[PDB]
mmCIF file of C-alpha atoms in Angstrom:
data_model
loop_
_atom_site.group_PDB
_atom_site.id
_atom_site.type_symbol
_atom_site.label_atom_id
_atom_site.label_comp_id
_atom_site.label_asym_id
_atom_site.label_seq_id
_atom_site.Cartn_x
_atom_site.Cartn_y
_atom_site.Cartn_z
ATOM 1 C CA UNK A 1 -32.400 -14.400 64.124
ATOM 2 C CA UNK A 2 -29.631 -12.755 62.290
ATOM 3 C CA UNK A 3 -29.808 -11.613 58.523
ATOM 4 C CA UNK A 4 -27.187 -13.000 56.581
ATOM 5 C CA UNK A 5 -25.816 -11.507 52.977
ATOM 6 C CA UNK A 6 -22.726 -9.673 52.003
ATOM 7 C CA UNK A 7 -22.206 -5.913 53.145
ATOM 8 C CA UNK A 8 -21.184 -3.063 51.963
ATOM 9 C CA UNK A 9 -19.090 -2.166 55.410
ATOM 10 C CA UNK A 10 -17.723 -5.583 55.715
ATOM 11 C CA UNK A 11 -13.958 -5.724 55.437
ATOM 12 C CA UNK A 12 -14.357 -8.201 52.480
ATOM 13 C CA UNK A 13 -16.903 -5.776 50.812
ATOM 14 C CA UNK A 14 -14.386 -2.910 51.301
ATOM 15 C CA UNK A 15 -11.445 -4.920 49.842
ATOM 16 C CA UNK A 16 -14.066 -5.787 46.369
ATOM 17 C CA UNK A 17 -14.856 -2.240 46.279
ATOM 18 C CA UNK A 18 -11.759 -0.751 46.395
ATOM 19 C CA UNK A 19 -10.588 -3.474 43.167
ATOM 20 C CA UNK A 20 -12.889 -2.410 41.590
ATOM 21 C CA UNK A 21 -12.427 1.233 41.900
ATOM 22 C CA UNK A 22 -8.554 0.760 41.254
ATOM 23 C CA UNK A 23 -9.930 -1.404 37.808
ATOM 24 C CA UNK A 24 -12.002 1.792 36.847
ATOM 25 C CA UNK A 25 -9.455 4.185 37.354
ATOM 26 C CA UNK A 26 -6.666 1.591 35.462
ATOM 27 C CA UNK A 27 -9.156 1.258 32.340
ATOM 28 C CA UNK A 28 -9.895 5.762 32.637
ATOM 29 C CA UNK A 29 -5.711 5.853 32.476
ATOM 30 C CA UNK A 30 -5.863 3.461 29.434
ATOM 31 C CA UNK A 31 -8.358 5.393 27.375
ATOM 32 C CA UNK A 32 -6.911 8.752 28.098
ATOM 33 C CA UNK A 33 -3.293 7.449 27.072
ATOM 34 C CA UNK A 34 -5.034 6.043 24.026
ATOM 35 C CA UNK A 35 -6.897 9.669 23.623
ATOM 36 C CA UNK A 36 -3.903 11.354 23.920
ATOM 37 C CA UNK A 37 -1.528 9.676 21.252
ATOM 38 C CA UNK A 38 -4.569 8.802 18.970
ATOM 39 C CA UNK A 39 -2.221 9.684 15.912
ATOM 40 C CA UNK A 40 0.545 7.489 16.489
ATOM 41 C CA UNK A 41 1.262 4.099 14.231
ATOM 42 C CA UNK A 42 0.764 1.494 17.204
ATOM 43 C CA UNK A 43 -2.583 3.037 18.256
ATOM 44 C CA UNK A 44 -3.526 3.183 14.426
ATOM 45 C CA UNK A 45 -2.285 -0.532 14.230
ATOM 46 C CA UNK A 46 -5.059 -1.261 16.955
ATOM 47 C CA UNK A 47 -7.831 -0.465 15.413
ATOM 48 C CA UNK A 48 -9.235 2.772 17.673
ATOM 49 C CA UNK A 49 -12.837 2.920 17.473
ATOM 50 C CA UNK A 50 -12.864 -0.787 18.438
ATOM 51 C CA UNK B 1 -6.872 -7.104 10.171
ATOM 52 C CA UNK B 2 -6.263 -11.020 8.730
ATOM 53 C CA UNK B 3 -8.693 -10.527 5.895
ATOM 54 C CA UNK B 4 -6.674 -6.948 4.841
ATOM 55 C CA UNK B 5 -2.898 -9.111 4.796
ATOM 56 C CA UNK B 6 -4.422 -12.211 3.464
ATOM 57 C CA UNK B 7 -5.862 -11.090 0.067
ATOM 58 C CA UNK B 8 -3.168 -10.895 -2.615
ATOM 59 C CA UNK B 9 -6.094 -9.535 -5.445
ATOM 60 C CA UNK B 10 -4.440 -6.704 -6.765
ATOM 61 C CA UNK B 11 -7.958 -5.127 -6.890
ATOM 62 C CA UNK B 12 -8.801 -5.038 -3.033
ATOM 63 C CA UNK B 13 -10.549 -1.460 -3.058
ATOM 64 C CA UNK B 14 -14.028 -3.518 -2.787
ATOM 65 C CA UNK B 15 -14.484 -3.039 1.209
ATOM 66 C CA UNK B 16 -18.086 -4.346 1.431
ATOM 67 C CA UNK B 17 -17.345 -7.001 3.756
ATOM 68 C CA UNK B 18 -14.424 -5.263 6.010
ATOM 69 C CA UNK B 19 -13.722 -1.335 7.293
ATOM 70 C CA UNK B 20 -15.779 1.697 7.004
ATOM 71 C CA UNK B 21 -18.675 0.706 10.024
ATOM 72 C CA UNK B 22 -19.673 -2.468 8.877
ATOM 73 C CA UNK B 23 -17.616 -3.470 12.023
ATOM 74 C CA UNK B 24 -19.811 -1.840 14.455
ATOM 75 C CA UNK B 25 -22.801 -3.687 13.017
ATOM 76 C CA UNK B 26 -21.497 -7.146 13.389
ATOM 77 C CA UNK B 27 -20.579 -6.561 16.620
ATOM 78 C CA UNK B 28 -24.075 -5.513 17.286
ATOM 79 C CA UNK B 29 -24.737 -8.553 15.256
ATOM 80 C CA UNK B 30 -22.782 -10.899 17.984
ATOM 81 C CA UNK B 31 -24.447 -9.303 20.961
ATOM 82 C CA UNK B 32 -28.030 -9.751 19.360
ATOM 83 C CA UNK B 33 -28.404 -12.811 20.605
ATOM 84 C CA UNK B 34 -27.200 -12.172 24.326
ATOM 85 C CA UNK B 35 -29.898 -9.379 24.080
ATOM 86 C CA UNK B 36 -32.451 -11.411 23.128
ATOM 87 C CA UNK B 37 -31.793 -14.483 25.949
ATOM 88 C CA UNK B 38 -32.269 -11.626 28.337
ATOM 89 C CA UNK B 39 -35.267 -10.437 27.114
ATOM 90 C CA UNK B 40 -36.921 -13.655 27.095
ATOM 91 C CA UNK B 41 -35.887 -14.689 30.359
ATOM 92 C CA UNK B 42 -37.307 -11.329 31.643
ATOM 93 C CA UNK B 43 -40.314 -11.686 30.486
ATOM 94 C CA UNK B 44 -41.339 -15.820 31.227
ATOM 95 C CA UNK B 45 -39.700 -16.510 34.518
ATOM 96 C CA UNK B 46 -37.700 -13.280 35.815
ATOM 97 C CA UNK B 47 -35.024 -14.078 38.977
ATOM 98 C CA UNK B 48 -36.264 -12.704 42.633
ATOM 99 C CA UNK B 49 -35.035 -12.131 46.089
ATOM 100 C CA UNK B 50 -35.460 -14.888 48.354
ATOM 101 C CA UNK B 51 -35.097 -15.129 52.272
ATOM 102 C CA UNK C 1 -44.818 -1.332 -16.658
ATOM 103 C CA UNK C 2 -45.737 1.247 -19.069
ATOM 104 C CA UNK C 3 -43.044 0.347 -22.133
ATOM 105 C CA UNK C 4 -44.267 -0.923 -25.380
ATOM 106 C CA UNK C 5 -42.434 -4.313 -26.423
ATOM 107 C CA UNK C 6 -39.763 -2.142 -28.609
ATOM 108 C CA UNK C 7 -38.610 -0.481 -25.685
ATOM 109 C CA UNK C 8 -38.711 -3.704 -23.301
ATOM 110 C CA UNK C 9 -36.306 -5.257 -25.992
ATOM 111 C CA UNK C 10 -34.007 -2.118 -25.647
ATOM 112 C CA UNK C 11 -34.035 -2.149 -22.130
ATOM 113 C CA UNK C 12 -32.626 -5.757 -22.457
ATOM 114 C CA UNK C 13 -30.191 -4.821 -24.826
ATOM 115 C CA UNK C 14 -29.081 -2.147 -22.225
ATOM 116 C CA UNK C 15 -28.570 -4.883 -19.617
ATOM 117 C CA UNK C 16 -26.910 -7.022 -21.771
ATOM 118 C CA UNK C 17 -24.238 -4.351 -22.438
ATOM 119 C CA UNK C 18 -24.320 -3.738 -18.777
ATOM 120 C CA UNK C 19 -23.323 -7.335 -17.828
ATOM 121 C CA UNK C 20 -20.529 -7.097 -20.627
ATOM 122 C CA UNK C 21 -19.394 -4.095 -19.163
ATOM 123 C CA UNK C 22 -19.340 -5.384 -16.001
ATOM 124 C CA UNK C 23 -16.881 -8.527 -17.015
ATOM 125 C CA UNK C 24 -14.703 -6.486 -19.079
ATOM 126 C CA UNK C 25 -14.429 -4.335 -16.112
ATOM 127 C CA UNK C 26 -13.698 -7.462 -13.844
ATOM 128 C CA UNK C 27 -11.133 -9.049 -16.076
ATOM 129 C CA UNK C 28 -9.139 -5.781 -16.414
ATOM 130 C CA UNK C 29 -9.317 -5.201 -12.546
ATOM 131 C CA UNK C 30 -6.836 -8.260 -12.566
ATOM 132 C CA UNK C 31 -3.171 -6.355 -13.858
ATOM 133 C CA UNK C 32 -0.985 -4.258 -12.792
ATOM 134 C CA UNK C 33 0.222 -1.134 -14.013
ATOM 135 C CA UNK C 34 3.852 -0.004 -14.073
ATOM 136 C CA UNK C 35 5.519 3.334 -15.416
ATOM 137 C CA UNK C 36 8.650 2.201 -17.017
ATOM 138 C CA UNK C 37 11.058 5.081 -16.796
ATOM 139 C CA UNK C 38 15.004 6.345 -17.711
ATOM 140 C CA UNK C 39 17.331 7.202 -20.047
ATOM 141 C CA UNK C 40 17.025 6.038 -23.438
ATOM 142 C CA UNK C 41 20.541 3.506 -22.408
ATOM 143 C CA UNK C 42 19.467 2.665 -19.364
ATOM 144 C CA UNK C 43 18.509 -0.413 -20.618
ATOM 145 C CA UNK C 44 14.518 -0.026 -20.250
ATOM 146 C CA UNK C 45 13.360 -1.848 -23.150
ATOM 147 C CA UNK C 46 15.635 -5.136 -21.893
ATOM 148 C CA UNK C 47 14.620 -4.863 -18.365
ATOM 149 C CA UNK C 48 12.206 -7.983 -18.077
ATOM 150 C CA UNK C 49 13.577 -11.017 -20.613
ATOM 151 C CA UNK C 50 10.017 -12.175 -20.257
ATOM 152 C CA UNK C 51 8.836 -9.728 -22.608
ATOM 153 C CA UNK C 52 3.888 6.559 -32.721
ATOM 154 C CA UNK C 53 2.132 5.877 -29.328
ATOM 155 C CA UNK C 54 2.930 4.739 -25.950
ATOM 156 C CA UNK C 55 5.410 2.107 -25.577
ATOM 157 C CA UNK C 56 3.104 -1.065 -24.124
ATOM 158 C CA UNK C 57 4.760 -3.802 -22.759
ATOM 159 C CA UNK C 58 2.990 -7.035 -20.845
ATOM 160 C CA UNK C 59 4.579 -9.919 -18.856
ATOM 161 C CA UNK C 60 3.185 -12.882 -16.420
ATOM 162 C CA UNK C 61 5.328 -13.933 -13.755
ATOM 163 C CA UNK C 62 3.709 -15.803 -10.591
ATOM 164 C CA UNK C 63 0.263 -15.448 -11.665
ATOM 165 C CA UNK C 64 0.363 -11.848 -11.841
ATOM 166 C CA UNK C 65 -0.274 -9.681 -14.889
ATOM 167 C CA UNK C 66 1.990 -6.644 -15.483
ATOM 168 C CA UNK C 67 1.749 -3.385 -18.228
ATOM 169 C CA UNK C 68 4.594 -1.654 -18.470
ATOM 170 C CA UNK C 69 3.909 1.792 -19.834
ATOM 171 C CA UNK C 70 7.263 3.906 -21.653
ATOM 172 C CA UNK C 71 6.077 7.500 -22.232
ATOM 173 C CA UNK C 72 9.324 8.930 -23.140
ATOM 174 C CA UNK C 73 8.384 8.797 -26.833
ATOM 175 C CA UNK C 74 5.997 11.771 -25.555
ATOM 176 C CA UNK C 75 7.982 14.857 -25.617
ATOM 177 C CA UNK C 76 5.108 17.198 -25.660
ATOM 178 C CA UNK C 77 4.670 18.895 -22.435
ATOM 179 C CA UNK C 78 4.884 16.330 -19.418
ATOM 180 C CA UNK C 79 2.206 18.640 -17.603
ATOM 181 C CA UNK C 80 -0.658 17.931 -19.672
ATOM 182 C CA UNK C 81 -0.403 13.996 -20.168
ATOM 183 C CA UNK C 82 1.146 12.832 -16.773
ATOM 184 C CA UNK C 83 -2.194 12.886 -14.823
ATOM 185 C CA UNK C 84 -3.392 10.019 -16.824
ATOM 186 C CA UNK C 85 -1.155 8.010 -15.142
ATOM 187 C CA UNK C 86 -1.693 9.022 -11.646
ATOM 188 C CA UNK C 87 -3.752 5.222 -11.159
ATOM 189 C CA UNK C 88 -0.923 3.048 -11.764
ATOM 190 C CA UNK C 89 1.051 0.951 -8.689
ATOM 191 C CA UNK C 90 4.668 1.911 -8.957
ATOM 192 C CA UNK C 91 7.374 4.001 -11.404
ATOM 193 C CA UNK C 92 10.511 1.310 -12.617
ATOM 194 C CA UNK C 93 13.218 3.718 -12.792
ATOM 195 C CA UNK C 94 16.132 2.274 -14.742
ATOM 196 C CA UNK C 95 19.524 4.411 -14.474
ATOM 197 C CA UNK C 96 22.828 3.412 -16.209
ATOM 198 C CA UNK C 97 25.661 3.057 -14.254
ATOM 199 C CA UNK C 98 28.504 3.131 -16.488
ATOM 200 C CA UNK C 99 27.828 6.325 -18.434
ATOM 201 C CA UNK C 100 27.902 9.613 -16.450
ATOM 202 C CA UNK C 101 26.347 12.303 -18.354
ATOM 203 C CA UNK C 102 23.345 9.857 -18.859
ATOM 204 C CA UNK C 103 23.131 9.380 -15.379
ATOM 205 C CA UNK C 104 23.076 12.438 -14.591
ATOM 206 C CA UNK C 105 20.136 13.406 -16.732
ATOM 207 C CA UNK C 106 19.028 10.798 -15.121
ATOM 208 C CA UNK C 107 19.031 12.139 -11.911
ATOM 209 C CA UNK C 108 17.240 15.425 -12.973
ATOM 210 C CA UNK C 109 13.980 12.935 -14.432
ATOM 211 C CA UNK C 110 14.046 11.166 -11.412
ATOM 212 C CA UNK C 111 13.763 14.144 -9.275
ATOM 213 C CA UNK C 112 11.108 15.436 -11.575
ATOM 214 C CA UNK C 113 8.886 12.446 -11.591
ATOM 215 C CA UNK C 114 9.308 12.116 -8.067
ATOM 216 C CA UNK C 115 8.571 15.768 -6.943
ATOM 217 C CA UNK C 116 5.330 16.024 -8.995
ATOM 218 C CA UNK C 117 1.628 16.933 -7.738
ATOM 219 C CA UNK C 118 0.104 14.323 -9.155
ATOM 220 C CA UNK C 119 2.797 10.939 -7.643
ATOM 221 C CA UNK C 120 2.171 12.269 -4.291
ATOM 222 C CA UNK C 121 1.607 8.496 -3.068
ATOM 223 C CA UNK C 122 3.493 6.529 -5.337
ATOM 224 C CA UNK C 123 6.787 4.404 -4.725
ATOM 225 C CA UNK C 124 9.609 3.804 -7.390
ATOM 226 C CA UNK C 125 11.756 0.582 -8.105
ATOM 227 C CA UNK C 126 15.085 2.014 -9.024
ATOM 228 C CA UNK C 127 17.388 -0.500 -11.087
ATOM 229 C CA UNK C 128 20.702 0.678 -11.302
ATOM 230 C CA UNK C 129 21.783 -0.945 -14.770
ATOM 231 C CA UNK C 130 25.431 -2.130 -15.882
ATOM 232 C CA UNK C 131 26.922 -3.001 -12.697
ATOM 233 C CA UNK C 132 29.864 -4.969 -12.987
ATOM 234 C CA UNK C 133 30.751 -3.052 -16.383
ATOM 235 C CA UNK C 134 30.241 0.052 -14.232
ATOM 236 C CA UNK C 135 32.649 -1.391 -11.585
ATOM 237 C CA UNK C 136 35.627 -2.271 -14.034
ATOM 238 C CA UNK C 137 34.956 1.485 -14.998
ATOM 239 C CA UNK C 138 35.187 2.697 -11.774
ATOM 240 C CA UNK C 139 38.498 1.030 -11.318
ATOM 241 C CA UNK C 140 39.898 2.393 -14.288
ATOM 242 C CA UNK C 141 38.315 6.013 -13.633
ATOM 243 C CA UNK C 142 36.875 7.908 -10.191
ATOM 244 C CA UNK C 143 33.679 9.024 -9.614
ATOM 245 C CA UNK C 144 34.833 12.383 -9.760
ATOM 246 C CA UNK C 145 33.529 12.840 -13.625
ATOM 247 C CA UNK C 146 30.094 13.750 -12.421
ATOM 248 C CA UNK C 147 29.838 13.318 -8.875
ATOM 249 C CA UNK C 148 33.370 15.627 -8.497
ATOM 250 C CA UNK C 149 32.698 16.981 -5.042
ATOM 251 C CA UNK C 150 32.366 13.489 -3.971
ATOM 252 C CA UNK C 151 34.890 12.417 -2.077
ATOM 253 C CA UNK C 152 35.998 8.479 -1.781
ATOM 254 C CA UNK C 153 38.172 5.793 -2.683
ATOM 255 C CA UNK C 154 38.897 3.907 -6.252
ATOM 256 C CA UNK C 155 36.464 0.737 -4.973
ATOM 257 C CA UNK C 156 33.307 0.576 -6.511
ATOM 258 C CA UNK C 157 31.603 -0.090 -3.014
ATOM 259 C CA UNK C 158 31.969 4.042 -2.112
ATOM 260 C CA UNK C 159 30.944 5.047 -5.463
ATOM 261 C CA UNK C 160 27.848 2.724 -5.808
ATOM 262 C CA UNK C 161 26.880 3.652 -2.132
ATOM 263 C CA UNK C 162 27.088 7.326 -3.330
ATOM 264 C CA UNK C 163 25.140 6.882 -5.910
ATOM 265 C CA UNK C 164 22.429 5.348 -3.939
ATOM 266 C CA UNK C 165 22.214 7.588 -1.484
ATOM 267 C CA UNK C 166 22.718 10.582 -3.885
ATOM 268 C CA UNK C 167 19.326 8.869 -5.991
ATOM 269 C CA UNK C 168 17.738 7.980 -2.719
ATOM 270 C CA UNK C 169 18.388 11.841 -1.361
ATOM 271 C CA UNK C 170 16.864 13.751 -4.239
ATOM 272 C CA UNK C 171 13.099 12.420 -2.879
ATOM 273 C CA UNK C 172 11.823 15.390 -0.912
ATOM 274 C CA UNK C 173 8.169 12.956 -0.394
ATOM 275 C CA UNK C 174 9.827 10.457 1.929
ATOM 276 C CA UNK C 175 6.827 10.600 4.098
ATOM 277 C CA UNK C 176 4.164 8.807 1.647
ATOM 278 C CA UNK C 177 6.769 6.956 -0.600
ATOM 279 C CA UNK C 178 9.857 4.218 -0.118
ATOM 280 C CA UNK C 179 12.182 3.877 -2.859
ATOM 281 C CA UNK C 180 13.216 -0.193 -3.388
ATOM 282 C CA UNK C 181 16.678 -0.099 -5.164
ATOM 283 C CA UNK C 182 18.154 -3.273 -7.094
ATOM 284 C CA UNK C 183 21.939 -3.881 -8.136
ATOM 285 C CA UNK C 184 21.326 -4.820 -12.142
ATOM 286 C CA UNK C 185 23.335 -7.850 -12.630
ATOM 287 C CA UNK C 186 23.929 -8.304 -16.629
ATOM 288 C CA UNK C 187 22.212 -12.077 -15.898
ATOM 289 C CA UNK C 188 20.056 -11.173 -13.254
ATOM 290 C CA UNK C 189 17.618 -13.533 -13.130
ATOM 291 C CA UNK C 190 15.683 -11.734 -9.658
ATOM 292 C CA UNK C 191 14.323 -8.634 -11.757
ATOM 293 C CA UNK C 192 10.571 -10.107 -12.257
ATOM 294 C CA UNK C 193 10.758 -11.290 -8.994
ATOM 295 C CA UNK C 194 11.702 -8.275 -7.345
ATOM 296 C CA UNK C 195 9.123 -6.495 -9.375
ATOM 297 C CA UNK C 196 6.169 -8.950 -7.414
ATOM 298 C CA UNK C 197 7.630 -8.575 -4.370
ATOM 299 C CA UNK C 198 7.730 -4.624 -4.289
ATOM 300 C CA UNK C 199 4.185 -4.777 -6.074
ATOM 301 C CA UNK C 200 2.846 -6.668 -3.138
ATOM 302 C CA UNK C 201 4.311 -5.211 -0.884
ATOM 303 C CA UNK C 202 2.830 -1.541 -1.578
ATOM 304 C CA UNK C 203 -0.260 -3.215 -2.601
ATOM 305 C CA UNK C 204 -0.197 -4.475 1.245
ATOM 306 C CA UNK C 205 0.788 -0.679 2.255
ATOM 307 C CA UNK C 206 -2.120 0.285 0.000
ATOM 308 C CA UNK C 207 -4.361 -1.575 2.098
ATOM 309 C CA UNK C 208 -3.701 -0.780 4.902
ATOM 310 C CA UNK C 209 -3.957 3.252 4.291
ATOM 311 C CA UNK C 210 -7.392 2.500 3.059
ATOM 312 C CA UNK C 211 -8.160 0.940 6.581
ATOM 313 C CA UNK C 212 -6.544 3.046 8.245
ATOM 314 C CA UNK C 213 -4.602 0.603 10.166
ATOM 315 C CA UNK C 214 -1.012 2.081 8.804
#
């Protein structure tokens, strides 16, 4: 019999991977831009340890 | 950031119930009880692979 | 405890003065303190129709309690009395339109209070007093009196825009501070009303530089 479950190599697998990379690396962009201009009145307004 | 722009008292230097880190422990406050469900269901019936 | 029943009756006493304290300390929490300042014609003393030491004045408008404070009576050395008014919300600046030599003394205490060490983070209300009798003026006579390298029409619009700006431009401390400046009507009937709005309004600011959220 065949073993049934969702794989890692599976195109569908590859596709949820990769989203989920691109998600990480969108969020990384976020906190460095936030980093970056952590002195500026609309981060300040936000509050940035939160 | 409603409770700073909502009170007119003139006197609103008393900041025991908003800024400094009291924050951080109410958040820890809300997540408490997510912790807590997890523990318990870890330790009386935890989940297991199945074929 | 240790105390004999003479010193368990002082210790009461104690707290007794303690919760006193404590309410007296509560009730004046609840004002508002104002440095009334300008020429001795600006038109200080009439600012509010509500109504030797310091000059104390005290007025409720809109459920909100405001002491207004006229050191000019003082004429020791500014140096050594202005830091007890460093905790107080806002300087009222009253300058009088019509004459020129007072308003240009006027000019030099406004630049003074403004520029000192101690009102590093504190915002004026500038009333410019006599208006309209300041405008007929200005029809009859230029600008060029005091303000003689200014350069502008007869109207009164140039010369009270000048004026303004000139009072708005001797601030160096624009970073920490916003000037809030009111035409004086003769009947205006806005002045305590202006006075609660700028008070909340920095009171608001105040806030939010404690949070940090500015």
């Amino acid at each position: 019999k065949e073993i049934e479950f969702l794989s890692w190599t599976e195109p569908f697998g590859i596709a949820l991977t990769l989203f989920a990379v691109l998600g990480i690396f969108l969020t990384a962009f976020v906190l460095g831009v936030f980093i970056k201009f952590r002195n500026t009145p609309i981060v300040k307004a936000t509050n940035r340890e939160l | 950031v409603l409770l700073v722009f909502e009170a007119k008292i003139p006197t609103s230097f008393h900041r025991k119930w908003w800024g400094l880190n009291l924050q951080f422990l109410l958040v820890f406050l809300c997540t408490f009880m997510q912790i807590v469900i997890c523990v318990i269901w870890l330790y009386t019936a935890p989940p297991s692979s199945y074929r | 405890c240790t105390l004999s029943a003479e010193d368990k009756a002082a210790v009461e006493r104690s707290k007794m003065i303690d919760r006193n304290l404590r309410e007296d300390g509560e009730k004046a929490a609840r004002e508002v303190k104002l440095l009334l300042l300008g020429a001795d014609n600006s038109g200080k003393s009439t600012i509010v129709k509500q109504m030797t030491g310091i000059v104390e004045t005290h007025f409720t408008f809109k459920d909100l309690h405001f002491k207004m404070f006229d050191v000019g009576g003082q004429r020791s050395e500014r140096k050594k009395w202005i830091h007890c008014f460093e905790d107080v919300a806002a300087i009222i600046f009253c300058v009088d339109l019509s004459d020129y030599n007072r308003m240009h003394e006027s000019m030099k205490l406004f630049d003074s209070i403004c520029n000192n060490k101690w009102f590093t983070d504190t915002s004026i209300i500038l009333f410019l007093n006599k208006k309209d009798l300041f405008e007929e003026k200005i029809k009859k006579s230029p600008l060029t009196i005091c303000y003689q390298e200014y350069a502008g029409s007869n109207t009164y619009e140039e010369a009270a825009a000048y004026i303004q700006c000139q009072f708005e431009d001797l601030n160096k401390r624009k970073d920490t501070k916003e000037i809030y400046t009111h035409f004086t009507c003769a009947t205006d009937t806005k002045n305590a009303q202006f006075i609660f709005d700028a008070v909340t309004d920095v009171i608001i600011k105040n806030n939010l530089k404690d949070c940090g959220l500015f």
